[PDB]
Every structure is written in structure tokens, then in C-alpha cells.
Write a protein that binds this ligand. Structure first.
Ligand SMILES: Nc1nc2c(ncn2[C@@H]2O[C@H](COP(=O)(O)OP(=O)(O)O)[C@@H](O)[C@H]2O)c(=O)[nH]1
Ligand SMILES: [Mg+2]
Length: 168
């Protein structure tokens, strides 16, 4: 069965950059901030080939369409920008919505602090991100879609492993 992943986060945090870094192993073109799209990708993970569909969301407004995306997704990447405190503050409210939609099942998610290459304009500490991940009961990663630092491929692979584990 295909693993269905959805990426959420405030506009501008780097959702589209992260997805394209995962799919193409580079980041060389800017991408329309308003475009929402789904990508299919096959990867060998551990022994086997796994098919995934990844939804790169654009508008973050709380709508019936957004609830549909949350019902569709099996695993979620919540992204913030380490240079932007406001984006970090949107993460827990997103989780609360997801919890309600996936009830009675547990939500499978990861927390990603992107733009780690901008350490000099950092507003959110690595420690704060770790503590928030603890509050979400999920794995935490800092990375840079721009530089590729942070092992973005392994981040997605590990979310696929978790989705599949929880399926039983
Ligand atoms: N310095 C830096 N800029 C980034 C990184 N990821 C994305 N960006 C930039 O941040 C802006 C928003 O990225 P985008 O992928 O469109 O964010 P989205 O709105 O969440 O899809 C663009 O100007 C990107 O070039 C990163 O890791 N480091
Ligand atoms: Mg985008």
C-alpha cells in the first residue's frame, strides 16, 4: 500500500523546498508559494521498494478542504522556520486539529525546523524544538532544504517506516 504523507506549516517555511530536495536531491529553482500539489515517489527503504504520495500544501487556512487533506494523510510533516518564531507557534495548534481528525487513532508525525543554514538569524533554539517534539510525542529534526544539511531523505524514509509500523 502507498504511504500518504502531507506537509504542513506556515507559508514561507520551506515546505516546497523540502519536498523538492527530497524528490530531486537539490534545490535550485524557486517555486510558486500558492501552488499545492501531490507527488508520487518510489524509493527502496531497507529491503523493499515503497511507493509514497506526498502532498505539498499551500494555503494554511482552517477549511473543509484542509480537513480533507488531513483525513487523506497517514503521516504528517510539520515544518517551521528556525528564523521565524511565529511559524514555530503554529505547530501545536495544527497537532490539536490533527488529533481531532484522526481520533481514535494516534497521529503519526515528525517536527522539522527548516533553514538551519541561517543560524545567524535563528529565533528558535534547537533545545526549544526538542522540547516541542517531546510535547508532540514525535521525532525532531533540524535541516536545510538549501544546503541539504540534516539528511532530508532519511527523515522522509523514517516517517514512512513509522507509518508502516503503525499500520501493523
Ligand atoms: N536559507 C534558506 N532558505 C530557504 C530554505 N528552504 C526554503 N528557503 C526559502 O524560503 C522561501 C520559502 O520557501 P518555500 O519552499 O516556497 O516555502 P513554502 O511556502 O513553505 O512552500 C523561498 O525563498 C526559499 O528559497 C532553507 O533551508 N534555507
Ligand atoms: Mg510552497
Amino acid at each position: 500500500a502507498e504511504v500518504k504523507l502531507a506537509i504542513f506549516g506556515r507559508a514561507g517555511v520551506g515546505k516546497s523546498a523540502l519536498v523538492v530536495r527530497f524528490l530531486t536531491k537539490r534545490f535550485i529553482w524557486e517555486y510558486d508559494p500558492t501552488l499545492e500539489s501531490t507527488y508520487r515517489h518510489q524509493a527502496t527503504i531497507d529491503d523493499e521498494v515503497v511507493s509514497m504520495e506526498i502532498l505539498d500544501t499551500a494555503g494554511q487556512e482552517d477549511t473543509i478542504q484542509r480537513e480533507g487533506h488531513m483525513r487523506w494523510g497517514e503521516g504528517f510533516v510539520l515544518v517551521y522556520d528556525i528564523t521565524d518564531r511565529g511559524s514555530f507557534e503554529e505547530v501545536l495548534p495544527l497537532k490539536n486539529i490533527l488529533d481531532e481528525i484522526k481520533k481514535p487513532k494516534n497521529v503519526t508525525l515528525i517536527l522539522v525546523g527548516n533553514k538551519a543554514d541561517l543560524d545567524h538569524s535563528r529565533q528558535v533554539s534547537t533545545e526549544e524544538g526538542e522540547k516541542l517534539a517531546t510535547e508532540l510525542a514525535c521525532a525532531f529534526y533540524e535541516c536545510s532544504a538549501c544546503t541539504g544539511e540534516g539528511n532530508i531523505t532519511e527523515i522522509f524514509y523514517e516517517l514512512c517506516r513509522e507509518v508502516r509500523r503503525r499500520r501493523m
